[PDB]
Amino acid sequence: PIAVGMIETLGFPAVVEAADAMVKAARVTLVGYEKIGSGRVTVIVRGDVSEVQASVSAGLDSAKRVAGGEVLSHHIIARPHENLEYVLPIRYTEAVEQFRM
Amino acid sequence: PIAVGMIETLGFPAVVEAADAMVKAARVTLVGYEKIGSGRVTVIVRGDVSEVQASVSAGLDSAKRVAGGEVLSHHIIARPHENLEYVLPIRYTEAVEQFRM
Amino acid sequence: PIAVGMIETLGFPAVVEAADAMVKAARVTLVGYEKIGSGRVTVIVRGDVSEVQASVSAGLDSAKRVAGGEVLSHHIIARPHENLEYVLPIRYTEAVEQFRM
Amino acid sequence: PIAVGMIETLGFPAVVEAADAMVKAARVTLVGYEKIGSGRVTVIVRGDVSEVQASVSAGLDSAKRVAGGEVLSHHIIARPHENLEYVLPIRYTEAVEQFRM
Amino acid sequence: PIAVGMIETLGFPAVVEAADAMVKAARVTLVGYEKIGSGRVTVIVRGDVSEVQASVSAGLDSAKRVAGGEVLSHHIIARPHENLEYVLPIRYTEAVEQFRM
Amino acid sequence: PIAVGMIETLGFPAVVEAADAMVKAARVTLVGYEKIGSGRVTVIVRGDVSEVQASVSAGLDSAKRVAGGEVLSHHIIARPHENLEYVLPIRYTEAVEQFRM
């Protein structure tokens, strides 16, 4: 029952700061980086919901301070249906298994 | 004769919530995630039409409450022509066979 | 010398409905789904010119009734040059031969 | 050294009409279809310069009559440097060799 | 080290003209064509800085004369750091070695 | 623990100049070039934080002087979490190892 947190920014430098602040703020794993066009990019973290809450809060705080930085949207899902794991890029991957809690 | 339900959002975090709420609300299978540019992303579910109708209703309800969320369009097709299955990314895939009802 | 009909929408769910209405309304084969960016997507049907004309008219009517539905452009070519078949994605493919008429 | 003709449209159905009108109007070969984002797509023809001029002129006339159709730009180069052949998608390919004049 | 020249236009027909004009005007090699979205495309030349200077001036002049033509930006770097050669698409490639000077 | 510097421009020629000025201004390695659409492109450097500061400052100064040049955003992270290395295109690669300090 692993939670998922997401921060979407306009521009790449701000999404890197969001990711960095998120994994430094709490026990979460950065598993994803998704581009959907219009300069909209999202970073996705997984972990226990309380950790994810703290991560996202810290990521939002730091991302908005980036020069030219813009946060567009953000969301947490405490208990994502496991169907999502097999369709959307929110899942752990072999390349980040070392960073799982 | 399996129905198809679709919710299109502006932004990725909102489309994840759309998918989550859809598959939790009724007996439907999330089979697809489609990017067409300009931040427009769609999630696609299959199931009996009445299930799909309930899922789409719940998905719209929750996606709109996502911070920075916006729903652009949505649609249900009760009985899609099977020609659509071989051209459009709405078909069941091997990766989600385990979630079929 | 088989005709080709095309409906371009802004948004994915309406293009799926466009495709559905087309192949249900008359004797045409859905052969293509083309993304050119910025939310612009086209579905492409082949068949006798009179069928194609019936399909497109229906597809336009149906797509516009989609919540958030929008049509950008549409066109029919009765006798497309065969040179187009080898450059533009309007040709029959193996995966839809079973739907040829 | 063979002339190159190009018509860029907003929307896909229009660019298909452009191509069709071009290869029907004179002795040219459709060799390329190029997407650069923003809904801008270009079709590219090769042939003798006076043929290319007649093809482009006809393509411009037909494409603009497409419902929802817009021509964005167009150009003819009578004698393109052969360096362009190896970098830009304007060259003949194996798939259209049967349509060389 | 070898200079690099760049012209970015809105629209594909205009970069083709920019490329053609550049390689005809001086001793430079066309090595690259780069799409970054929103219809922005750049053609890249390499050569002695004085040559590149002449190529770019000619490309700018000719590109702006293209029907629907628009130049968005352009730049010359006389002596690019070799690090750029291994990251950005400005380097000579096998396909254009025959055109080096 | 190696710092990361990022400059995002609107347009490609300007991002090339940014990279060039960056690696020439201090001891940093250009490791990445990232496109996220809508003409937004970012160049990424690694090095000691004081070096990255000097490079980014110099890249910003030079990029804004490019004809049609436009900087959208920029950021420095002195001590990026190692998790980001396996998700975001900010890491060293084989192709640039010879330029590591």
From Swiss-Prot, chains A, B, C, D, E, F:
Query: What biotechnological or industrial uses does this protein have?
Result: Heterologous expression of 12 carboxysomal genes in E.coli (ccaA, ccmK2, ccmK3, ccmK4, ccmL, ccmM, ccmN, ccmO, ccmP, rbcL, rbcS, rbcX) leads to the formation of bodies that resemble carboxysomes, have densely packed paracrystalline arrays and RuBisCO activity. These structures open the door to generating carboxysomes in plant cells to increase their photosynthesis and productivity, as well as tailoring bacterial microcompartments to specific metabolic needs and molecule delivery.
Quote the Gene3D superfamilies the UniProt record gives: 3.30.70.1710
Q: What happens when the gene is disrupted?
A: Cells do not grow in normal air but do grow on 2% CO(2), called a high-CO(2) requiring phenotype, HCR. Cells make aberrantly large polar bodies instead of wild-type carboxysomes, no accumulation of CcmO. An alternatively generated deletion mutant does not form abnormal polar bodies.
A GO BP annotation: photosynthesis
Using the UniProt record, give the first listed, main subcellular location. other
A molecular function GO annotation = structural constituent of carboxysome shell
User: Which InterPro entries does the entry link to?
Assistant: Bact_microcomp_CS (IPR020808), BMC_dom (IPR000249), BMC_shell (IPR050575), CcmK (IPR046380), CcmK-like_sf (IPR037233), CcmK/CsoS1_BMC (IPR044872)
Domain BMC stretches: 3-89
Which Pfam family is one of this chain's hits? BMC
Question: Where is this protein localized, as stated in its record?
Answer: Carboxysome
Q: Where are the transmembrane segments?
A: none
Q: Name one GO cellular component term.
A: carboxysome
**Which keywords does the record carry?**
Bacterial microcompartment, Carbon dioxide fixation, Carboxysome, Photosynthesis
Quaternary form?
Homohexamer. Interacts with CcmO in the carboxysome. Interacts with CcmN.
The record's comment about this protein's domains reads:
The tight homohexamer forms a pore with an opening of about 5 Angstroms in diameter and is positively charged.
Family to which this protein belongs:
Belongs to the bacterial microcompartments protein family. CcmK subfamily.
Role = One of the shell proteins of the carboxysome, a polyhedral inclusion where RuBisCO (ribulose bisphosphate carboxylase, rbcL-rbcS) is sequestered. Assembles into hexamers which make sheets that form the facets of the polyhedral carboxysome. The hexamer central pore probably regulates metabolite flux.
What this protein is called in its record is Carboxysome shell protein CcmK2
| Organism in which the protein naturally occurs | Synechococcus elongatus (strain ATCC 33912 / PCC 7942 / FACHB-805)
Its gene is ccmK2
